[PDB]
Amino acid sequence: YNSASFSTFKCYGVSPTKLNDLCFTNVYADSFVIRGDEVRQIAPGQTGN
Amino acid sequence: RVQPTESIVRFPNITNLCPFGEVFNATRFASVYAWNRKRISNCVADYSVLYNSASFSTFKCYGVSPTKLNDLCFTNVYADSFVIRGDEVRQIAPGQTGNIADYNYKLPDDFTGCVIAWNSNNLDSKVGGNYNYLYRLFRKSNLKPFERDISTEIYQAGSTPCNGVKGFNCYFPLQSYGFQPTYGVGYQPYRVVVLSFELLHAPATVCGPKKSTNLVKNKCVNFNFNGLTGTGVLTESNKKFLPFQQFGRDIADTTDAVRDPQTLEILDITPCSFGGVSVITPGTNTSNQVAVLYQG
Amino acid sequence: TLVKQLSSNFGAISSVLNDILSRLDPPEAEVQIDRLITGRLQSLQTYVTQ
Amino acid sequence: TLVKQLSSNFGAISSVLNDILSRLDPPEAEVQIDRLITGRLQSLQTYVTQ
Amino acid sequence: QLPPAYTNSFTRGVYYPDKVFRSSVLHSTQDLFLPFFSNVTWFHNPVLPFNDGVYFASTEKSNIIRGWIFGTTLDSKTQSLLIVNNATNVVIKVCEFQFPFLEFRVYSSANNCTFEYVSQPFKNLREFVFKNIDGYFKIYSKHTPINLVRGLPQGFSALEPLVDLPIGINITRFQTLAAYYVGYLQPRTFLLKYNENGTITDAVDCALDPLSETKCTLKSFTVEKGIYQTSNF
Ligand SMILES: *[C@@H]1O[C@H](CO)[C@@H](O)[C@H](O)[C@H]1NC(C)=O
Ligand SMILES: *[C@@H]1O[C@H](CO)[C@@H](O)[C@H](O)[C@H]1NC(C)=O
Ligand SMILES: *[C@@H]1O[C@H](CO)[C@@H](O)[C@H](O)[C@H]1NC(C)=O
Ligand SMILES: *[C@@H]1O[C@H](CO)[C@@H](O)[C@H](O)[C@H]1NC(C)=O
Ligand SMILES: *[C@@H]1O[C@H](CO)[C@@H](O)[C@H](O)[C@H]1NC(C)=O
């Protein structure tokens, strides 16, 4: 949060305030580049080309 | 012991009928963060004819047997109405926590009553979209059992104070709904009505459909006074009460004096005579004779 | 003390047996009556030992 | 012996009240707390009598 | 506006805590009671905070009209009460009002009235207790005539319930419409002594002083010579 404002940071299922206390195992991170209008395609329950 | 010989029921004479229907089939059921209240009082109830499941998905009663609502009664019966999806009906349960149970409506851990929910997709499902329904999602702290909260403020997430800017790290707490017939059954709007009430020393004016019976004096009979059960003998009392007193106790703290709900007179309660039985025998080698001795 | 011990709930919804019987189904009422029975039996044992 | 009796589980998942409170939800922690209370009460009743 | 005066009560303000009947029993109860030997204001009409109950004792000669106004903001933004004993009408109404001491009707207008109750048309010490619990309103009263020049006299008097109201609104401020005394209530533990006739005759605290705690633990009003165990520190 202290860094520059992100285009999309809405989080589902888990709240950032409660994200510090709760924790998981084997965090996976995936990085990719898309178009600006393709952000809506990158969403759970969304189908796109 | 002495066995009872008769059973008598004494209930106040009530002609007005409880308007339970009004809350169970109405039009503008409100949202979950602003659930509305209804204080049914002073009327004979008919849970019997409404236990009959019209379409009710759930009728789970906690703390009371569902089929025993008619004979007994409570004090100051309540009712709440709000609309919620099929998947969130489980979150309305005593003790159990949830995303919407901890932000809009939290039942007390000692709740008594029933969570009466049914389906509303047949009528309250617009093809264009039932977008008039909102539900709170964000709150600074947890709610309280039976808590009311209407005021809406711009949520602040950590740093970057909003001050009504709706900017970064700022979210509107209320979220819309997409209630349409096209969606799945698991997300259709469901109408939920929860009944809350309590049993109190103060007279319970609300009562179920039951018949009265004439008073009996100086006999071991079963008695019933506004749902209070027991066993004993009824005798006219001389202890002067007060115009606002109904029950009567003693050092052991057991109900021994009652005021008649019909004739408004003072009675007494006394358990039937009992005692130990002791037998005297001169032995089983000289005779089979005995001599019973009642203790008291 | 033995008489006053009869008013405690011991974890049941109410300390009056008739009130539980007239307000709950037998399958649910049994588990409530069990706690009351255990509490009263414990009190009686203590009194006898003393 | 009386002090050593504190650490026993008496059938509960754990023998520390704070752990029971934090790990489990309030609706379920009641049963564990009740089990611990019953065990400790029985230990205290064995004491005093001795 | 005269500055307030702080006089000391003399163990007054005990009411029947329930509708049940007890006789010749030393009973212990835990509820909201007025602490003994506590200063009470001696107003001789500003808005007073109202936290949990209030003890309103007023001295009057020939039962003049009495008025009380409750609420939260008193600006028609929240429901208000207008308890008053008037010859024209004894109206007990809960409604929005814009506001002022006796225009016969001091409120400017009434838009949405949720509740409205009208009763029958209408030296001496008058005592009242008002409470707001679980969406209920309760009023206790008693009329004990007295002939002294002093205020709250020595003695022990009982208060009895008069009217219960299921108003269930948010109340946090107090206002009133001869002199009257105001004292607030706190959670305490009391021991009550109903007599053979069923009325209250004596009562003692359980937190005022160590002797009171010793009497409270023994559940008696008389303590014989000896050392006792009271509580834990
Ligand atoms: C109905 O109840 C009232 C109590 O206010 C009583 O006075 C009246 O006699 C009752 N009706 C009958 C027919 O007994
Ligand atoms: C019964 O008791 C008497 C008493 O001494 C004795 O004489 C007799 O033999 C006994 N009879 C039997 C069958 O034991
Ligand atoms: C009540 O308040 C006054 C105000 O100064 C104070 O003097 C008095 O001691 C208080 N009463 C008690 C019992 O302390
Ligand atoms: C009543 O109003 C006050 C504001 O005067 C507010 O702080 C409070 O939350 C409201 N509700 C209750 C139950 O006091
Ligand atoms: C109880 O009431 C009777 C009748 O009014 C009265 O004679 C008696 O003195 C009262 N009891 C006490 C202890 O005052």
Side-chain angles (χ1 to χ4, degrees), chain E residues 81-156:
Chain E
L81 261 167
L82 188 153
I83 294 107
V84 60
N85 192 323
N86 190 6
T88 77
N89 63 6
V90 64
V91 290
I92 302 299
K93 65 176 73 174
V94 176
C95 187
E96 305 302 318
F97 303 116
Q98 274 286 324
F99 280 134
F101 172 79
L102 277 296
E103 302 185 6
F104 267 58
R105 297 279 71 59
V106 292
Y107 57 92
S108 312
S109 58
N111 197 9
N112 303 343
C113 304
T114 51
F115 181 63
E116 191 155 6
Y117 157 62
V118 178
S119 189
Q120 74 285 343
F122 270 99
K123 285 294 297 181
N124 270 5
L125 193 62
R126 260 205 293 275
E127 312 192 30
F128 294 84
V129 179
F130 303 87
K131 291 192 308 176
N132 195 4
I133 178 62
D134 77 357
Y136 269 68
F137 212 81
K138 274 178 288 286
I139 297 89
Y140 311 87
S141 73
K142 176 60 152 294
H143 298 81
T144 64
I146 201 67
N147 282 331
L148 282 72
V149 289
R150 192 261 181 277
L152 308 154
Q154 271 287 342
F156 186 77

Side-chain angles (χ1 to χ4, degrees), chain B residues 240, chain E residues 195-197 201:
Chain B
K240 313 170 75 43
Chain E
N195 62 354
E196 48 164 3
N197 283 24
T201 306

Side-chain angles (χ1 to χ4, degrees), chain B residues 63-68 71-72 74 199 229-230 252, chain C residues 3-4 7 13 16 18-19 21-26:
Chain B
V64 186
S65 159
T67 191
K68 296 185 181 70
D71 59 358
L72 59 87
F74 293 103
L199 190 59
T229 80
Chain C
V3 165
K4 282 188 183 68
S7 81
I13 62 168
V16 176
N18 313 331
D19 189 74
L21 287 175
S22 298
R23 224 172 70 199
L24 279 183
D25 278 293

